[PDB]
Amino acid sequence: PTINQLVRKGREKVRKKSKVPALKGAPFRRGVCTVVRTVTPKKPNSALRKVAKVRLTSGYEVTAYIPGEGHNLQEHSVVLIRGGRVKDLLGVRYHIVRGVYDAAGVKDRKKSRSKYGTKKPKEA
Amino acid sequence: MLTDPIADMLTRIRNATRVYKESTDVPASRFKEEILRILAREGFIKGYERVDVDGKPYLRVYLKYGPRRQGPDPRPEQVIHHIRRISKPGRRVYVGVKEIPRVRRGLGIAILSTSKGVLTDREARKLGVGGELICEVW
RNA sequence: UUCCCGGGCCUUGUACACACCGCCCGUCACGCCAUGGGAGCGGGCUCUACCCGAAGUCGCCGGGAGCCUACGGGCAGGCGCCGAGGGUAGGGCCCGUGACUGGGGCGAAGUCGUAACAAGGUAGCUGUACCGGAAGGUGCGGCUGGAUCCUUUCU
RNA sequence: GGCUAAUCCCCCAUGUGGACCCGCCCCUUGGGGUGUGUCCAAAGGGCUUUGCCCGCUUCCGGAUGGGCCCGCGUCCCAUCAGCUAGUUGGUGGGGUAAUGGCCCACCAAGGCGACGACGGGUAGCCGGUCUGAGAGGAUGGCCGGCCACAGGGGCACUGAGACACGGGCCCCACUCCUACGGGAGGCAGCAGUUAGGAAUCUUCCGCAAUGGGCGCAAGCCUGACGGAGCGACGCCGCUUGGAGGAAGAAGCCCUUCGGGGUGUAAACUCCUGAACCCGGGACGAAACCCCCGACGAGGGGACUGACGGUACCGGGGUAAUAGCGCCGGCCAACUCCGUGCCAGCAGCCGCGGUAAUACGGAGGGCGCGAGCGUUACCCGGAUUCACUGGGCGUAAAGGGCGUGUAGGCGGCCUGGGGCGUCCCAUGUGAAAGACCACGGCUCAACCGUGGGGGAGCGUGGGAUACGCUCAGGCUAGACGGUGGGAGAGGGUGGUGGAAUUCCCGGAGUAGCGGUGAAAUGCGCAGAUACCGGGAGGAACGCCGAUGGCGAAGGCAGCCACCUGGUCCACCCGUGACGCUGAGGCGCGAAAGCGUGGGGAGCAAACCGGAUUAGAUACCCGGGUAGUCCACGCCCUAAACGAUGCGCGCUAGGUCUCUGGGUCUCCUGGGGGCCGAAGCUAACGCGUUAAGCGCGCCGCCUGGGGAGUACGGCCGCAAGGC
Ligand SMILES: [Mg+2]
Ligand SMILES: [Mg+2]
Ligand SMILES: [Mg+2]
Ligand SMILES: [Mg+2]
Ligand SMILES: [Mg+2]
Ligand SMILES: [Mg+2]
Ligand SMILES: [Mg+2]
Ligand SMILES: [Mg+2]
Ligand SMILES: [Mg+2]
Ligand SMILES: [Mg+2]
Ligand SMILES: [Mg+2]
Ligand SMILES: [Mg+2]
Ligand SMILES: [Mg+2]
Ligand SMILES: [Mg+2]
Ligand SMILES: [Mg+2]
Ligand SMILES: [Mg+2]
Ligand SMILES: [Mg+2]
Ligand SMILES: [Mg+2]
Ligand SMILES: [Mg+2]
Ligand SMILES: [Mg+2]
Ligand SMILES: [Mg+2]
Ligand SMILES: [Mg+2]
Ligand SMILES: [Mg+2]
Ligand SMILES: [Mg+2]
Ligand SMILES: [Mg+2]
Ligand SMILES: [Mg+2]
Ligand SMILES: [Mg+2]
Ligand SMILES: [Mg+2]
Ligand SMILES: [Mg+2]
Ligand SMILES: [Mg+2]
Ligand SMILES: [Mg+2]
Ligand SMILES: [Mg+2]
Ligand SMILES: [Mg+2]
Ligand SMILES: [Mg+2]
Ligand SMILES: [Mg+2]
Ligand SMILES: [Mg+2]
Ligand SMILES: [Mg+2]
Ligand SMILES: [Mg+2]
Ligand SMILES: [Mg+2]
Ligand SMILES: [Mg+2]
Ligand SMILES: [Mg+2]
Ligand SMILES: [Mg+2]
Ligand SMILES: [Mg+2]
Ligand SMILES: [Mg+2]
Ligand SMILES: [Mg+2]
Ligand SMILES: [Mg+2]
Ligand SMILES: [Mg+2]
Ligand SMILES: [Mg+2]
Ligand SMILES: [Mg+2]
Ligand SMILES: [Mg+2]
Ligand SMILES: [Mg+2]
Ligand SMILES: [Mg+2]
Ligand SMILES: [Mg+2]
Ligand SMILES: [Mg+2]
Ligand SMILES: [Mg+2]
Ligand SMILES: [Mg+2]
Ligand SMILES: [Mg+2]
Ligand SMILES: [Mg+2]
Ligand SMILES: [Mg+2]
Ligand SMILES: [Mg+2]
Ligand SMILES: [Mg+2]
Ligand SMILES: [Mg+2]
Ligand SMILES: [Mg+2]
Ligand SMILES: [Mg+2]
Ligand SMILES: [Mg+2]
Ligand SMILES: [Mg+2]
Ligand SMILES: [Mg+2]
Ligand SMILES: [Mg+2]
Ligand SMILES: [Mg+2]
Ligand SMILES: [Mg+2]
Ligand SMILES: [Mg+2]
Ligand SMILES: [Mg+2]
Ligand SMILES: [Mg+2]
Ligand SMILES: [Mg+2]
Ligand SMILES: [Mg+2]
Ligand SMILES: [Mg+2]
Ligand SMILES: [Mg+2]
Ligand SMILES: [Mg+2]
Ligand SMILES: [Mg+2]
Ligand SMILES: [Mg+2]
Ligand SMILES: [Mg+2]
Ligand SMILES: [Mg+2]
Ligand SMILES: [Mg+2]
Ligand SMILES: [Mg+2]
Ligand SMILES: [Mg+2]
Ligand SMILES: [Mg+2]
Ligand SMILES: [Mg+2]
Ligand SMILES: [Mg+2]
Ligand SMILES: [Mg+2]
Ligand SMILES: [Mg+2]
Ligand SMILES: [Mg+2]
Ligand SMILES: [Mg+2]
Ligand SMILES: [Mg+2]
Ligand SMILES: [Mg+2]
Ligand SMILES: [Mg+2]
Ligand SMILES: [Mg+2]
Ligand SMILES: [Mg+2]
Ligand SMILES: [Mg+2]
Ligand SMILES: [Mg+2]
Ligand SMILES: [Mg+2]
Ligand SMILES: [Mg+2]
Ligand SMILES: [Mg+2]
Ligand SMILES: [Mg+2]
Ligand SMILES: [Mg+2]
Ligand SMILES: [Mg+2]
Ligand SMILES: [Mg+2]
Ligand SMILES: [Mg+2]
Ligand SMILES: [Mg+2]
Ligand SMILES: [Mg+2]
Ligand SMILES: [Mg+2]
Ligand SMILES: [Mg+2]
Ligand SMILES: [Mg+2]
Ligand SMILES: [Mg+2]
Ligand SMILES: [Mg+2]
Ligand SMILES: [Mg+2]
Ligand SMILES: [Mg+2]
Ligand SMILES: [Mg+2]
Ligand SMILES: [Mg+2]
Ligand SMILES: [Mg+2]
Ligand SMILES: [Mg+2]
Ligand SMILES: [Mg+2]
Ligand SMILES: [Mg+2]
Ligand SMILES: [Mg+2]
Ligand SMILES: [Mg+2]
Ligand SMILES: [Mg+2]
Ligand SMILES: [Mg+2]
Ligand SMILES: [Mg+2]
Ligand SMILES: [Mg+2]
Ligand SMILES: [Mg+2]
Ligand SMILES: [Mg+2]
Ligand SMILES: [Mg+2]
Ligand SMILES: [Mg+2]
Ligand SMILES: [Mg+2]
Ligand SMILES: [Mg+2]
Ligand SMILES: [Mg+2]
Ligand SMILES: [Mg+2]
Ligand SMILES: [Mg+2]
Ligand SMILES: [Mg+2]
Ligand SMILES: [Mg+2]
Ligand SMILES: [Mg+2]
Ligand SMILES: [Mg+2]
Ligand SMILES: [Mg+2]
Ligand SMILES: [Mg+2]
Ligand SMILES: [Mg+2]
Ligand SMILES: [Mg+2]
Ligand SMILES: [Mg+2]
Ligand SMILES: [Mg+2]
Ligand SMILES: [Mg+2]
Ligand SMILES: [Mg+2]
Ligand SMILES: [Mg+2]
Ligand SMILES: [Mg+2]
Ligand SMILES: [Mg+2]
Ligand SMILES: [Mg+2]
Ligand SMILES: [Mg+2]
Ligand SMILES: [Mg+2]
Ligand SMILES: [Mg+2]
Ligand SMILES: [Mg+2]
Ligand SMILES: [Mg+2]
Ligand SMILES: [Mg+2]
Ligand SMILES: [Mg+2]
Ligand SMILES: [Mg+2]
Ligand SMILES: [Mg+2]
Ligand SMILES: [Mg+2]
Ligand SMILES: [Mg+2]
Ligand SMILES: [Mg+2]
Ligand SMILES: [Mg+2]
Ligand SMILES: [Mg+2]
Ligand SMILES: [Mg+2]
Ligand SMILES: [Mg+2]
Ligand SMILES: [Mg+2]
Ligand SMILES: [Mg+2]
Ligand SMILES: [Mg+2]
Ligand SMILES: [Mg+2]
Ligand SMILES: [Mg+2]
Ligand SMILES: [Mg+2]
Ligand SMILES: [Mg+2]
Ligand SMILES: [Mg+2]
Ligand SMILES: [Mg+2]
Ligand SMILES: [Mg+2]
Ligand SMILES: [Mg+2]
Ligand SMILES: [Mg+2]
Ligand SMILES: [Mg+2]
Ligand SMILES: [Mg+2]
Ligand SMILES: [Mg+2]
Ligand SMILES: [Mg+2]
Ligand SMILES: [Mg+2]
Ligand SMILES: [Mg+2]
Ligand SMILES: [Mg+2]
Ligand SMILES: [Mg+2]
Ligand SMILES: [Mg+2]
Ligand SMILES: [Mg+2]
Ligand SMILES: [Mg+2]
Ligand SMILES: [Mg+2]
Ligand SMILES: [Mg+2]
Ligand SMILES: [Mg+2]
Ligand SMILES: [Mg+2]
Ligand SMILES: [Mg+2]
Ligand SMILES: [Mg+2]
Ligand SMILES: [Mg+2]
Ligand SMILES: [Mg+2]
Ligand SMILES: [Mg+2]
């Protein structure tokens, strides 16, 4: 462009959309399972995936994914939403944080435990 | 018209030298004469001349290159390795004394046009003036 | 040596490369899903005209209509301008809702053809126009990003 | 309704002075000085009581704090393009500490906007902070500054000061009291409650310090403030031990069953001595006051500590918490089971469908450690908005073409000025912060003292090369005179032959047409094939080109007029008149639209004949709009060189169109091909640039959704932008 073009019109700073309305800019948001169920994934993958439609303190009703190996959630469990998404099925913008509110943590998990929210076990 | 006199000077030189010409006419100006005086004393051109072609004033600019290269491509090393305009008609550039660049690690020069007249970065700096920055050479 | 089958060498076009048994386009139906378009309905803000208009300052009367008085004047009080705000009628914004509703996804390539890519088997593409279950055909211009000099689908 | 005091309110005098109207002096916006008239002062109280202290009064300064006003700076949307009636100015007046339409009365008709007015959305600004090589981006919690608010909206009063958070009034909403008449509130002060939320503390101590109000002082008030508490919220310091200790124990993992691993790790041995206990114990505090002097200077004396029996010091003393993420590649870290597209992982490539370093557990390892992960948000990478620092022939991207408006840009020489620009001095650039230096807490974090740097703006002074500007001059750009060209450049009147179809006539006999084959069709009402005449419409063979013109679109028989552009010669005239161009305006293949004409061939739609599984097609027969003209709309395109215009510089060779030339050839201007330098991702481009450069305009910023929706504008409509 010329200079006189940059003085005339000049460059355009461009902004970016959010990958999520957990709204608030909130780091997490509380919700209530409205319904819970199992879904089929996408492209190359097969599976039965675990998820819950959740109604929000932010007012929107969204689909979040229940991480890890078992779970306890049903009609109106209440749960916390953190977001981060699942590529392989769609409409899921957010994960459930396991171990908060009415959602249990995955029990027996020895290995990586902060994620999955399981307490440290003792022994002899 | 000719929108930058000067640019076109520098360019003539450039395409001139790239094609290894022994020298070149450029259309004449008191200023463009200063600039080559600087450019010359400073080592880059063999020197120049005030000529007249077809009844019109020109400056011949004689032209220097380094010695004959070996192996394939014997074309000799350029002296004027690079020359480029800085201030440009409708976009101008004027620099404080503290803002005068210094060039290719000092291995080249800048040409400034000041109210001390036309001089190199080093000259300006010791003079202590700033000005329009005409060109990068190295 | 034209053709059928397989094959070699040169070349050419390709959107094919598990490589022509390759690749591909469009229409339908019923679920089911988010999205978007949207009359009417409810809410909000705003602007214009008109009318009612608190507090208060400012104006004016302040009267054998009240109180004080050196009779100069003051105060009560009264009337007016403005005026928060309301009301009635109109535009405009924004929100919520919403009958009806275009395209997208999965249900399952399911269906009907074969439009394009090799001269894709009528070269393709394009603006425009009319037709047509559907890709589409066709007319008129135009471009080359066009091979070489009967029709016969689909894997 | 009634008494009553004052530093409360009046009246009279004094007038240092001040105030106001008028006149002159100086000065320059309402600044001083001065004269004439007029108008204006006051308050007492205490003592060591006749002279001191705390007060009052009028004036002139200082100081500090403010009002008001100007230049400049100060987010997104043009799918917000017009806005304005106190609007913009003027005279007079109101009002105020003061200017001003702040308001008001009457005059004038102005003010503002693409240099983005009006509208919409969003937001307290700043010192600074975060990030970044930098340039930039992003941010404004804490501390300082400035503004605004005090449940929502109006208003004024008192006052030096307010239109006042714990003052007043009214309306509204809400809460509470109520004899239903009428009343009372305002934590966005500190604590604390509740609600909301992923989430944010003690109804603590103190008035010792600092600071503020009042007070002659004593003192009083001070949820400002100094301190303590709670939260790994951050930052910093420190601990869970140090030296020994095997050819290397059990357990556990791997195993090619020999051995490998955890691992000097443990055990054990020997030092030290976090925690904890004892003792001692601050600085932060020295003035106000009091005494001598003189209530000064100066000297002497006295009191006072929330934090706290804390910091610190000395003695004694115990071997005394470790966790979290990772180990497929980006990326440091591998093996065995389990599992079998499941269960699961997943930031992205992607893992899992029976030998998974990728899921899950194990052993081992890597990284950090009182922390380690996660999600969220900013900057980075991202040169992916490109000022530094990108692009547009095919990748996204040159407008369809032209004319010029605003605007950007501007040959050669001389002189003036000195606005841009450069320099010097100076003022400002508070403190905090950042940088450096010493220093204080045992270190550090944290804190002090000092030093340095600084863009920017104000002022004075200076330089004049470049930019501007004014004056002069020149001719290499531009234009003009004269002369010589070529051309499907454009508008209008005109005419000419060939062929098609039809009408007429002649002769003339059974088929013609058509295809892959054929049917449909036309033919004895005599077609095809031939000759003659006529009518009518459209288009222009050969020349004709790998040619020419034109800005594009586009333009072909011949003649006449009307008229555009352009090239070469001569070097004659002007004297920089130049380039580009948002917007605007005008052109703009075809198809399409409106009204009127025209209609030979051709032909969407249509109507039939074939082919085919079907054939809404390709082939055949026929045919309407339309194609042609006129006027008016429409405004698109593979509107292609998929390459904006202009200017200058950088080998050649060959072919060609058109000029001039002392005519193997030279010299301009077009059209082509090959190619030097160089450019490109390559293909290619290459003096007709895609090379080297400057000016100016248009344009792009992953694919799809979509050239869709929505809004505006255009249009008769189709539809365009
Ligand atoms: Mg650029
Ligand atoms: Mg898979
Ligand atoms: Mg439950
Ligand atoms: Mg993430
Ligand atoms: Mg828990
Ligand atoms: Mg994991
Ligand atoms: Mg400077
Ligand atoms: Mg064969
Ligand atoms: Mg062979
Ligand atoms: Mg190939
Ligand atoms: Mg086939
Ligand atoms: Mg669904
Ligand atoms: Mg909707
Ligand atoms: Mg809907
Ligand atoms: Mg309504
Ligand atoms: Mg009224
Ligand atoms: Mg009376
Ligand atoms: Mg009276
Ligand atoms: Mg009045
Ligand atoms: Mg009124
Ligand atoms: Mg009103
Ligand atoms: Mg709505
Ligand atoms: Mg659908
Ligand atoms: Mg799709
Ligand atoms: Mg499907
Ligand atoms: Mg086709
Ligand atoms: Mg198509
Ligand atoms: Mg096809
Ligand atoms: Mg075809
Ligand atoms: Mg065909
Ligand atoms: Mg077409
Ligand atoms: Mg058709
Ligand atoms: Mg065609
Ligand atoms: Mg093609
Ligand atoms: Mg061809
Ligand atoms: Mg053939
Ligand atoms: Mg099929
Ligand atoms: Mg009384
Ligand atoms: Mg006097
Ligand atoms: Mg007097
Ligand atoms: Mg008196
Ligand atoms: Mg008094
Ligand atoms: Mg003084
Ligand atoms: Mg002052
Ligand atoms: Mg002051
Ligand atoms: Mg001031
Ligand atoms: Mg008026
Ligand atoms: Mg008004
Ligand atoms: Mg006035
Ligand atoms: Mg007007
Ligand atoms: Mg902001
Ligand atoms: Mg706000
Ligand atoms: Mg830094
Ligand atoms: Mg950047
Ligand atoms: Mg910065
Ligand atoms: Mg800011
Ligand atoms: Mg706060
Ligand atoms: Mg602050
Ligand atoms: Mg201020
Ligand atoms: Mg308010
Ligand atoms: Mg206020
Ligand atoms: Mg409140
Ligand atoms: Mg209020
Ligand atoms: Mg007072
Ligand atoms: Mg006042
Ligand atoms: Mg108030
Ligand atoms: Mg309060
Ligand atoms: Mg009240
Ligand atoms: Mg509070
Ligand atoms: Mg709650
Ligand atoms: Mg606190
Ligand atoms: Mg207390
Ligand atoms: Mg105190
Ligand atoms: Mg004090
Ligand atoms: Mg005092
Ligand atoms: Mg005393
Ligand atoms: Mg009190
Ligand atoms: Mg405190
Ligand atoms: Mg907590
Ligand atoms: Mg905690
Ligand atoms: Mg915290
Ligand atoms: Mg062992
Ligand atoms: Mg062993
Ligand atoms: Mg040891
Ligand atoms: Mg020992
Ligand atoms: Mg010991
Ligand atoms: Mg003691
Ligand atoms: Mg002390
Ligand atoms: Mg002391
Ligand atoms: Mg005191
Ligand atoms: Mg005291
Ligand atoms: Mg004494
Ligand atoms: Mg005394
Ligand atoms: Mg003393
Ligand atoms: Mg003393
Ligand atoms: Mg104590
Ligand atoms: Mg003790
Ligand atoms: Mg000790
Ligand atoms: Mg000891
Ligand atoms: Mg131990
Ligand atoms: Mg030990
Ligand atoms: Mg790393
Ligand atoms: Mg590795
Ligand atoms: Mg299983
Ligand atoms: Mg197995
Ligand atoms: Mg297998
Ligand atoms: Mg296995
Ligand atoms: Mg496998
Ligand atoms: Mg593994
Ligand atoms: Mg992994
Ligand atoms: Mg693993
Ligand atoms: Mg482990
Ligand atoms: Mg630490
Ligand atoms: Mg953290
Ligand atoms: Mg980012
Ligand atoms: Mg960078
Ligand atoms: Mg790029
Ligand atoms: Mg370009
Ligand atoms: Mg393409
Ligand atoms: Mg393109
Ligand atoms: Mg073009
Ligand atoms: Mg185009
Ligand atoms: Mg143009
Ligand atoms: Mg132009
Ligand atoms: Mg101009
Ligand atoms: Mg010049
Ligand atoms: Mg001069
Ligand atoms: Mg200047
Ligand atoms: Mg001078
Ligand atoms: Mg200052
Ligand atoms: Mg500073
Ligand atoms: Mg520095
Ligand atoms: Mg130190
Ligand atoms: Mg510091
Ligand atoms: Mg300093
Ligand atoms: Mg300084
Ligand atoms: Mg700095
Ligand atoms: Mg600075
Ligand atoms: Mg300065
Ligand atoms: Mg001078
Ligand atoms: Mg200019
Ligand atoms: Mg002149
Ligand atoms: Mg002549
Ligand atoms: Mg002529
Ligand atoms: Mg002649
Ligand atoms: Mg002619
Ligand atoms: Mg012609
Ligand atoms: Mg002609
Ligand atoms: Mg003609
Ligand atoms: Mg006839
Ligand atoms: Mg006959
Ligand atoms: Mg006959
Ligand atoms: Mg027959
Ligand atoms: Mg026929
Ligand atoms: Mg017929
Ligand atoms: Mg017949
Ligand atoms: Mg018949
Ligand atoms: Mg007969
Ligand atoms: Mg007949
Ligand atoms: Mg018949
Ligand atoms: Mg006969
Ligand atoms: Mg006949
Ligand atoms: Mg005839
Ligand atoms: Mg006719
Ligand atoms: Mg005729
Ligand atoms: Mg041609
Ligand atoms: Mg053309
Ligand atoms: Mg002519
Ligand atoms: Mg001419
Ligand atoms: Mg001449
Ligand atoms: Mg002349
Ligand atoms: Mg002359
Ligand atoms: Mg234009
Ligand atoms: Mg047209
Ligand atoms: Mg047409
Ligand atoms: Mg028509
Ligand atoms: Mg007609
Ligand atoms: Mg026909
Ligand atoms: Mg048919
Ligand atoms: Mg077939
Ligand atoms: Mg048929
Ligand atoms: Mg036909
Ligand atoms: Mg019609
Ligand atoms: Mg039609
Ligand atoms: Mg252009
Ligand atoms: Mg000749
Ligand atoms: Mg040429
Ligand atoms: Mg080369
Ligand atoms: Mg380049
Ligand atoms: Mg070439
Ligand atoms: Mg060029
Ligand atoms: Mg290129
Ligand atoms: Mg991009
Ligand atoms: Mg997209
Ligand atoms: Mg379109
Ligand atoms: Mg819109
Ligand atoms: Mg529309
Ligand atoms: Mg309309
Ligand atoms: Mg269309
Ligand atoms: Mg257009
Ligand atoms: Mg267009």
Residues contacting residue A48 through CB under 8 Å, at least 6 positions apart = A38, A39, A40
Contact status of A4 with chain B (Cβ, < 8 Å)? yes
Query: Contacts for A15-22 with beta carbons within 8 Å, 24 or more apart?
Result: A19/A83, A19/A85, A19/A93, A20/A83, A20/A93, A20/A94, A21/A58, A21/A60, A22/A58, A22/A81, A22/A82, A22/A83, A22/A94
3-state DSSP assignment of residue B23 = strand
Resolution given for this structure, in angstroms: 3.5
Is residue A40 within 8 Å of residue A49, measured between CB atoms? yes
Which domains does chain B carry?
A: 3-80 (3.30.1370.30), 81-138 (3.30.1490.10)
A91 CB below 7 A from strand C atoms: yes
State the residue range of the domain holding A106: 1-124
* CA distance, residue B54 to nearest chain A CA (Å): 37
DSSP secondary structure string for all residues of A43-84? SS----EEEEEEEETTS-EEEEE--SS-----TT-EEEE---
At A124, which helix (H) or strand (E)? Answer: none
Half-sphere exposure (Cβ direction) of A25: Cα atoms closer than 13 Å = 0
Q: What is the DSSP letter of B42?
A: T
Closest CA to A19 of A85, A90, A88, A87: A85
Number of domains chain A contains: 1
Dihedral pair phi/psi, residue B37, rounded to 5°: -50, -45
Residues contacting residue B20 through CB under 8 Å, at least 6 positions apart = B65, B75, B76
Is residue A3 within 8 Å of residue B91, measured between CB atoms? yes
Q: Stated in angstroms, how far is A9 CA from D718 C1'?
A: 37
3-state DSSP assignment of residue B57 = strand
3-state DSSP assignment of residue B133 = strand
CATH of the domain at A4: 2.40.50.140
Closest CA to A105 of A120, A122, A121, A117: A117
- What Å distances lie between residue B117 and A114, B5, B71, B112, CA to CA? 73, 18, 45, 8
Q: CA B67, CA B22: separation in Å to the nearest integer?
A: 14
- Closest residue in A to B92 (Cα) is A3
